[PDB]
Task: inverse folding
C-alpha cells in the first residue's frame, strides 16, 4: 500500500479486503504474513573480536611490520647455537608491539552499546490487535501483526505498526510522536484523508506510527505497513546503511603509509642492487650462503626504521588525555579518535527541542484587563522569568517585582489555571529536578500558578516535595471540581465546572475555560475587569485579537492560550454530559478573564555558544521537526537569525525541500540555516548534502529522529537528558546538558590536532633519520651500527615519552578565532619536508660516523684501517695481512652503543626544539613545557639504566660508556639544535636566563680538541 493517507478509509479497507470487527480470516492472515513477514526490526549482530582484529591487521604499515617480524623469525632460525635465546627477542618484541597496537585499538573502538537492538525498546511487548472473525478483542503479542490487520489502541498503549486511522473513540486521540518529531506535545488525530502524494509525518494526521505512545483517547485503525516498511523501519535502515568513514587525520596517515610502503620498496630494491656490488656472483664466494642474511638483515632493519611504531600508542595516549579533560568538563567521550575531529568541524547541525531549548514548556507572558476605553482597552501585560518546571520564578510587569495578591484578575486567572488543568507537578528526590506528570501545557500552567503566591502562602521552610503543589492544593481547597468538559476538535477548548467549598458563598456555580484564542474569544460576550464584570465591545475584541496575533506571529511565536470563566452556568442536573456537540452550546457566555503565552525556552548558555561558533568559523544550522514559525522564532531568540533578518530563502521545510530544483537542492544546503518539519531521512539528507561539499559536520540532538543524522555525520553529540537512542548513536554525550561544552570541545580538539601534528612530524623525522642511517651502512658496506631491537626501543620508549610531552604543549592564543582547517590539508609542507629530510640525513650521517669513529679514529680503543676495510664480511682467517687485529672486533658493542647514544641524544635534542613549528628555542624556553624536560630526563635515566643494569645490556648489544666517549657523543649530538634553529630562522625570514644556562656547558664539552683521520674519500 502506497500513499495510504491520500486514499479514503474505504479504499484502504477494500485494498486489504478488510471489514471492521471482521478484519481477517485464518488464511488471509497467513498470506499477509508470508507476503511481508513479521512486525520486527532485524537487530544488528554484535561485532566479534576476531573480525575486528582481522580488519585492524589490514593496515599497510602493520602488514609491513608483520612481514618484517616473520622474515626476522626466519633469519633467526638460521642463527647458530652460540648465541642464547636473545636471538629470538626481535621477532618476539615486534609481535608484542603488534598485538599491543591491536589491543589498544580494540580498546579505542570497542563500544558495548548496539545501534538497534538495545535502542528499539519503543516497540510494544503486547498490543490488543487482530479484530479477526474468531472473537472481539485479542491481546496477542505485537510480534506477528500483518498489514491487513485491524488494531485498537488505548491510553498508554504504544502503536505496533503503521496504522491508518478508521474510527476515533472518546472524541480525542492524543498521540505522542516524539520519536519521529522530537516534540512531546499531543497530536490530535482525525480520520479524514489528506490528499497530497508527498507529505511529511507531521502532515499525516490520519495515520499512526510505530513506537509512539498515546497520551489519551482510544481508537480503531487498519495497519498499512509493518516491520521495515514503517517509519521507525526507515530510521533503522538509515541507522544500518551508514558506515563511519575514516577521519581526515586517518586518511592523511593512510596516504603517508602508502607513500612509505612504496619508498620502502624502492629503497630495498636499491639496496639489493648495491649488495650485488659488494657480493657479486662472478667473484668467487658464498654470495648466496651468507649474502642473503646480510641483505635480509637490512630489509628487516629498514622496515623497522621506516615504521613509526610508537605513533599509534602516543596518539591513543593523547586522545585519552583529551577525553579525560572532557570528562572533567562533565562531557563523556565514547570514541577517542573523534576528539580531534571536533577541531575541523565546518558546520554544526542541531536539534531544536531538548538540545537548544530546555524541553520544559513554561509560560513567559500573560495579560489581564485593567481599564476599558472607548472601543479600546488597557492590557496589564506581565512577563514570567524561568525556563524550568521548578516553581522558582517571579512576575514582571514592566520589569518590576509584582505582588499578585493586590490584583484580583491575576487571582482569578491563577485559580482558573490551577483548576482547569489535569496535569500537575511532582519532585524527584533522587534526581533533584521537577518533572511533568502530564501534559506540558498544563504543567506549565501549574508552574505559573505556583510561581506567584496569589494567596500569599508562606513557603519559608516547606520541603521541596511539598513545595511543588502547595499553592495548587491551597487553591483547590477553596474550589472543588464537580466535573470537567473534555477538549474537543470543533470547539478547541476545555471547560471545568467548580463549586466553592464555603457553605455561605453567594456564588455557587463557576465554569472556567481554557482554549484556543479564536473560538474562546468569539464565544466570549463579556470582559472581566478586576472584580467587576463588563459588557464586551467590538474595539476591545479587535485589540485583544491583534495582541494575540502579535504574540503568536512575531519574534517570539508563543503558543497562545485564552482564558475565560462562566459566571452563570446551568445546573449540574440540567446538563447532558454525553456528547461534545452540547459542550460548545453550553460554552457561549464566557467572560474573558485573561490570556497566557508559552514556549519552549532556550537554555541560558546557547546564544553565547552560537556566537562563539560563528567566531571560530563554524556555521550552526538548526534542523527540527517542529513547525517553521517556532523554529524561526527560536533561531532569532538564540541568535542564529537576526531579529529583523529576512528568512525567505534561508528557512525551509521538508515539503519545500523535497520538490526543490536539483541546483537549488544544492543551494539550499549551501545557504539556508534553518530547517523545520523534516523527517529523520530529511536530516540525514541534509547532513549528506553538507558532507558532499567536503565539510565536516557536527550533529547535536537528543531524540530518536536525530539518530540517523547523528550516525551519518562525522561527529555526533547527544544531550545527557535525551533518549538513549541519541546517546548511543553519538560519539559524545553532554552529561551536564551544557551547550558551551561543544565550543570547549572544539577548542580542545584544535589544540590536540596541533600537538599531534607536532609529535607526528617529530616521530617521522626520527624514523627517516634511522632509515638514512641503515641505508648508508648498507651502501658503504660498513659493519652494522643500529640493530632492529635498538630501533624498537628508541622508537617506542625514548620517543613516546618526548612525544607525549610534545602532546602536552600549551594551546595557541588565537586557536578559537581561526577558521576551521581544510580537511585535505597536507600534514607536511614542502619547506618543512626539506627541514625534516635534512634532519634525517644528518641523523643518519652522524650515527654512521659515530660507528665509524670507534672503528677508525678510536681514542683509547682499537683503531681499524681506512675505508678499504669498510667491507667486513670478506675478512677471514689467513687473510692477505689486511691488519694484525682480530676479525671478531667488528661485532663489538662499542660502535653499536655509540650509534645508539648518538641517536638517543639527537632525538632528545629534537624533542627539545620540536616545541614549536617555526619559533626558535631561544624565544620560548623548554621550561614552558615542564613535562618536556621531565620526559627527556626520564628517557635519559632509562637509557642509563639499560646501559648499567645487569641483564639489559645483553638484549641490546650495548656496553657502558666512559666519560670521553660520552663527551664525544654529546659533541656529535649538539649541532642538531643549531641546525634546527638555523632552519627555523630561514623559515621566519623567507629567553636570557635560559641562554646563560647553556653557555658554561657548550664551552666545557667542546674544550677538548679531538680530530679524525678519515679524509681519503672526500
Ligand atoms: F527535538 Al527535534 F527535531 F526538534 F528532534
Ligand atoms: Mg529533541
Result:
Amino acid at each position: 500500500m502506497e500513499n495510504a493517507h491520500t486514499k479514503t478509509v474505504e479504499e484502504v479497507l477494500g485494498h486489504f479486503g478488510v471489514n471492521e470487527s471482521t478484519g481477517l480470516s485464518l488464511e488471509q492472515v497467513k498470506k499477509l504474513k508470508e507476503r511481508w513477514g513479521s512486525n520486527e526490526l532485524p537487530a544488528e549482530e554484535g561485532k566479534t573480536l576476531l573480525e575486528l582484529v582481522i580488519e585492524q591487521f589490514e593496515d599497510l604499515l602493520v602488514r609491513i611490520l608483520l612481514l618484517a617480524a616473520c622474515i626476522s623469525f626466519v633469519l633467526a632460525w638460521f642463527e647458530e647455537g652460540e648465541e642464547t635465546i636473545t636471538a629470538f627477542v626481535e621477532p618476539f618484541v615486534i609481535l608484542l608491539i603488534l598485538v599491543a597496537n591491536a589491543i589498544v585499538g580494540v580498546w579505542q573502538e570497542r563500544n558495548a552499546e548496539n545501534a538497534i537492538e538495545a535502542l528499539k525498546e519503543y516497540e510494544p511487548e503486547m498490543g490488543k490487535v487482530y479484530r479477526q472473525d474468531r472473537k472481539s478483542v485479542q491481546r496477542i503479542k505485537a510480534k506477528d501483526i500483518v498489514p491487513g490487520d485491524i488494531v485498537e489502541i488505548a491510553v498508554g498503549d504504544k502503536v505496533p505498526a503503521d496504522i491508518r486511522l478508521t474510527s476515533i473513540k472518546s472524541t480525542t486521540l492524543r498521540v505522542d510522536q516524539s520519536i519521529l518529531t522530537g516534540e512531546s506535545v499531543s497530536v490530535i488525530k482525525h480520520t479524514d484523508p489528506v490528499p497530497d502524494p508527498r507529505a511529511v509525518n507531521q502532515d499525516k494526521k490520519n495515520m499512526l506510527f510505530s513506537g509512539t505512545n498515546i497520551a489519551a483517547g482510544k481508537a480503531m485503525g487498519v495497519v498499512v505497513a509493518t516491520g521495515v516498511n514503517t517509519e521507525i523501519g526507515k530510521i533503522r535502515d538509515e541507522m544500518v546503511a551508514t558506515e563511519q568513514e575514516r577521519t581526515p587525520l586517518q586518511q592523511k596517515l593512510d596516504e603517508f603509509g602508502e607513500q612509505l610502503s612504496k619508498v620502502i620498496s624502492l629503497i630495498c630494491i636499491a639496496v639489493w642492487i648495491i649488495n650485488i656490488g659488494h657480493f657479486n656472483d662472478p667473484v668467487h664466494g658464498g654470495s648466496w650462503i651468507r649474502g642473503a642474511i646480510y641483505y635480509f638483515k637490512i630489509a628487516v632493519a629498514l622496515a623497522v626504521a621506516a615504521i613509526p611504531e610508537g605513533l599509534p600508542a602516543v596518539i591513543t595516549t593523547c586522545l585519552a588525555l583529551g577525553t579525560r579533560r572532557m570528562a572533567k568538563k562533565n562531557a563523556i567521550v565514547r570514541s577517542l579518535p573523534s576528539v580531534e575531529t571536533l577541531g575541523c568541524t565546518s558546520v554544526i547541525c542541531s536539534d531544536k527541542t531538548g538540545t537548544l531549548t530546555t524541553n520544559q514548556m513554561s509560560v513567559c507572558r500573560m495579560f489581564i484587563l485593567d481599564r476599558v476605553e472607548g472601543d479600546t482597552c488597557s492590557l496589564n501585560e506581565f512577563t514570567i522569568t524561568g525556563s524550568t518546571y521548578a516553581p522558582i520564578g517571579e512576575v514582571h510587569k514592566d520589569d518590576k517585582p509584582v505582588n499578585c495578591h493586590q490584583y484580583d484578575g491575576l487571582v482569578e486567572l491563577a485559580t482558573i489555571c490551577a483548576l482547569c488543568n489535569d496535569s500537575a507537578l511532582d519532585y524527584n528526590e533522587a534526581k533533584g529536578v521537577y518533572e511533568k506528570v502530564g501534559e506540558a501545557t498544563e504543567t506549565a500552567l501549574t508552574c505559573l500558578v505556583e510561581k506567584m503566591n496569589v494567596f500569599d502562602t508562606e513557603l519559608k521552610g516547606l520541603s521541596k516535595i511539598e513545595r511543588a503543589n502547595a499553592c495548587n492544593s491551597v487553591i483547590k481547597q477553596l474550589m472543588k471540581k464537580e466535573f470537567t468538559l473534555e477538549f474537543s476538535r470543533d470547539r478547541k477548548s476545555m471547560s471545568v465546572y467548580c463549586t466553592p467549598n464555603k457553605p455561605s458563598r453567594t456564588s455557587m456555580s463557576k465554569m472556567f475555560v481554557k482554549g484556543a484564542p479564536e473560538g474562546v474569544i468569539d464565544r466570549c460576550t463579556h470582559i472581566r475587569v478586576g472584580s467587576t464584570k463588563v459588557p464586551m465591545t467590538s474595539g476591545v475584541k479587535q485589540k485583544i485579537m491583534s495582541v494575540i496575533r502579535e504574540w503568536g506571529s512575531g519574534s517570539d511565536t508563543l503558543r497562545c492560550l485564552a482564558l475565560a470563566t462562566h459566571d452563570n452556568p446551568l445546573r449540574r442536573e440540567e446538563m447532558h454530559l454525553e456528547d461534545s456537540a452540547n459542550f460548545i452550546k453550553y460554552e457561549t457566555n464566557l467572560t474573558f478573564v485573561g490570556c497566557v503565552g508559552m514556549l519552549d525556552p532556550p537554555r541560558i548558555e546557547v546564544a553565547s555558544s552560537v556566537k562563539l561558533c560563528r567566531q571560530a568559523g563554524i556555521r550552526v544550522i538548526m534542523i527540527t521537526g517542529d513547525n517553521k514559525g517556532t523554529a524561526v522564532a527560536i533561531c532569532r531568540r538564540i541568535g542564529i537569525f537576526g531579529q529583523d533578518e529576512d528568512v525567505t530563502s534561508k528557512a525551509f521545510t521538508g515539503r519545500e525541500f523535497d520538490e526543490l530544483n536539483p541546483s537549488a537542492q544544492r543551494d539550499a544546503c549551501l545557504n539556508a540555516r534553518c530547517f523545520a518539519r523534516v523527517e529523520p531521512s530529511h536530516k540525514s539528507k541534509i547532513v549528506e548534502f553538507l558532507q558532499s561539499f567536503d565539510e565536516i559536520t557536527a550533529m547535536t540532538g537528543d531524540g530518536v529522529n536525530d539518530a540517523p543524522a547523528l550516525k551519518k555525520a562525522e561527529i555526533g553529540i547527544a544531550m545527557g537528558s535525551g533518549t538513549a537512542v541519541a546517546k548511543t548513536a553519538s560519539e559524545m554525550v553532554l552529561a551536564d546538558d551544557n551547550f558551551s561544552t561543544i565550543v570547549a570541545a572544539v577548542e580542545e580538539g584544535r589544540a590536540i590536532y596541533n600537538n599531534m601534528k607536532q609529535f607526528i612530524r617529530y616521530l617521522i623525522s626520527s624514523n627517516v633519520g634511522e632509515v638514512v642511517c641503515i641505508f648508508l651502512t648498507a651502501a658503504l658496506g660498513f659493519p652494522e651500527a643500529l640493530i632492529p631491537v635498538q630501533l624498537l626501543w628508541v622508537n617506542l620508549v625514548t620517543d613516546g615519552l618526548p612525544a607525549t610531552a610534545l602532546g602536552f604543549n600549551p594551546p595557541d592564543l588565537d586557536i578559537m578565532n581561526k577558521p576551521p582547517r581544510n580537511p585535505k590539508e597536507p600534514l607536511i609542507s614542502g619547506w618543512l619536508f626539506f627541514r625534516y629530510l635534512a634532519i634525517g640525513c644528518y641523523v643518519g650521517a652522524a650515527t654512521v660516523g659515530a660507528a665509524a669513529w670507534w672503528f677508525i679514529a678510536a681514542d683509547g680503543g682499537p683503531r681499524v684501517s681506512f675505508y678499504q676495510l669498510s667491507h667486513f664480511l670478506q675478512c677471514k682467517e689467513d687473510n692477505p695481512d689486511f691488519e694484525g687485529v682480530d676479525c671478531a672486533i667488528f661485532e663489538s658493542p662499542y660502535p653499536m652503543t655509540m650509534a645508539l647514544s648518538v641517536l638517543v641524544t639527537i632525538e632528545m635534542c629534537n624533542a627539545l626544539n620540536s616545541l614549536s613549528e617555526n619559533q626558535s628555542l631561544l624565544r620560548m624556553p623548554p621550561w614552558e613545557n615542564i613535562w618536556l624536560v621531565g620526559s627527556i630526563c626520564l628517557s635519559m635515566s632509562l637509557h642509563f639504566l639499560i646501559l648499567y643494569v645487569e641483564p639489559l645490556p645483553l638484549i641490546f648489544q650495548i656496553t657502558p660508556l666512559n666519560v670521553t666517549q660520552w663527551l664525544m657523543v654529546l659533541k656529535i649530538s649538539l649541532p642538531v639544535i643549531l641546525m634546527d634553529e638555523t632552519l627555523k630562522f630561514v623559515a621566519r625570514n623567507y629567553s636570557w636566563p635560559f641562554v646563560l644556562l647553556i653557555m658554561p656547558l657548550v664551552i666545557w664539552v667542546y674544550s677538548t680538541d679531538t680530530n679524525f683521520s678519515d679524509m681519503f674519500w672526500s
